[PDB]
Design a protein around this nucleic acid. Sequence first.
DNA 1: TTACGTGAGTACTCACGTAA
DNA 2: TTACGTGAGTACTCACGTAA
Lengths: 189, 190, 185, 189
Amino acid sequence: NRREEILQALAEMLESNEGASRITTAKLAKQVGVSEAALYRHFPSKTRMFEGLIEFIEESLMSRINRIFDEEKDTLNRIRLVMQLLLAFAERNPGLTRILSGHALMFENERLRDRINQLFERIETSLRQILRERKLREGKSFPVDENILAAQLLGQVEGSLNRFVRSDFKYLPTANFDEYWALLSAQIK
Amino acid sequence: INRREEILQALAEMLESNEGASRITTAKLAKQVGVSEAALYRHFPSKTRMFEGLIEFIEESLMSRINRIFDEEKDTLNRIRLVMQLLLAFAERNPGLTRILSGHALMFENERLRDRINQLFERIETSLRQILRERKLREGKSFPVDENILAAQLLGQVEGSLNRFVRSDFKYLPTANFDEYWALLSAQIK
Amino acid sequence: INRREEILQALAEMLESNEGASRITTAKLAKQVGVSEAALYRHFPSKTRMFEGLIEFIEESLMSRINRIFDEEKDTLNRIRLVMQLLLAFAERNPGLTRILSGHALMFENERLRDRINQLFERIETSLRQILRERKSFPVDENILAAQLLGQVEGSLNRFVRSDFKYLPTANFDEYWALLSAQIK
Amino acid sequence: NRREEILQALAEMLESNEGASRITTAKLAKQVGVSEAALYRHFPSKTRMFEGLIEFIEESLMSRINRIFDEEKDTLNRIRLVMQLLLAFAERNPGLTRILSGHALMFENERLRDRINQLFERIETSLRQILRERKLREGKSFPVDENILAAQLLGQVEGSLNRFVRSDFKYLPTANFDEYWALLSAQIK
DNA sequence: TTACGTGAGTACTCACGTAA
DNA sequence: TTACGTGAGTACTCACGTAA
């Protein structure tokens, strides 16, 4: 549980207004209430601390993506749920969002970006999968090719999250989601 | 100035390389310009001002062409098309500056700078809101939702493409698939 | 304690040496302790705080000894003799710290520190002003005599510093006080 | 006049609040009106700039002191005059006073401070000389040794100078000089 | 786990060059 | 004399190291 106390505090730091700046191992140490070397007994480096946060984000998102594939069998509903999950997750975890948008990683090992790109590739592939199953489940397909649309949907989400982090979390992603979904539906249907 | 511009350029170039993902120290920048750190401060009071100048080029260059589009293109639908097609093309020809546009390169500098870029986006979205309201009130195009929701999605695709351009180390072109994207975004406002 | 006190000791030591006539950089101060520059910052947030640590010691030492003079010596003229003596003896026993009282060492540091030393002298002069009202002898003005007195002392501290610590502040104090006390009744 | 224009400028900055800190050549150039390369074709180093200021002070003061020996033949009056001359010069030159007390010399080459110690030595010798001539002139000497007395008199002056610069030029050196004198003569004579 | 600590860096400064 | 510098600092920071 100790190993989690660290990742949880690191997450709380990124959420606060301090998350906009470099989270020093000393400041992180003050949140956990332990010494600096007390952190380096669960994590070889600072980068492993982020690598663990990233894994968490991926775990939540992909798991829930799959749950939707089993729970819901209607194509449009599937896209709706995934779009909502992505924006809602970002809204409940502003600090983790700073890692998804890649701003918090600016101060860390530039290789962590590979994990971020692999996470996005999983979301995209998942999105693409849902769209492909339409002609089979409904007979109809989409105006644009599945790959293009998957990328288009993923782009709107990244853009939406970049604004969230940009505005200092003032611009909420899920606020007006219903009207937004109604817009996509009229576009995708 | 000659040497003054050599600085800004040196910066933009570094922002394009793989170093753009990490902090650009004055030591590294000085080397890239082939001068001493002191020479740097002779053209700029602080590292921040150096970035400001780049942002100044972005604000001017973008607001320049956006104004030209209004005096030239009058059709509300195509103006909206050219607006974002400009941002995507501008970012694609200025990879390094995109890191400023997405706000990643400005994490090592004064907050005040990021504000400068947030405003740049506020204005761009404000214009889109205008163009959409006119198309609705003058051409009676009954949208299935508020202009804010539409202008928000149009800006989302753009930022979505800027950030992904950065993620992939500039491998995924922001203008890629634009035409297809537009055929799905315009259908609800034609 | 162990290291925080060691640093303040190193700073005073350098302030006493020939290095005190020049800026005491952290690189150099760090070398005088046997540790790295980063090491200094674990006990002090700024170089300014290091100097405040010394200014506090100077204050605590001077003011507390002045309160002991009052409760031990009841004679007015002796009180005055003893206070001036304390100031000159303090500086003579602490060459480096005098470099601070004279204000030359603070030229390389935060302006607020010089503000502190002025505040300390006001205190000294005030307590010296109070004593002179216990009188008296020869049209005397408390406010004026107190300034002359603290002034004389201050002149002794600068002569001590600028003279590379050769002109001891307490030298000839007995003669100086002989002529003064006699004419001041 | 350019050489002098630099000296006045520097003198002026030493007289302002900036005098409390390092007077960079960059700023000295600004004040003068010319460039940094200009200031240097008139002065080899920055130390030559302060050296030329110590020279003004040295002559301003000794020439006056020698004139006193010649113009006044009463011992006490001779002492009164020199002490007044010293304090009066300081008061009229707040800037150069940051040099005499040595505070402004902390940013420059040590040599400059050894020269100041030479100046004070010439001053003290003057006093020590004026005092020795009392037995011959009046047949009476002082109740204290000429050395000790001289060192004490100059000390009062250095003290007044230190307070003047200290108080940001609020404590005037010539202030209440008359009271100090009334009590001094009373101690000697 | 805490005590005690540091190599490499980090934005910025200053008195003082030198070539045509 | 301009144009165009710079070697050596400066106070202060940080992720990660070593021994009890």
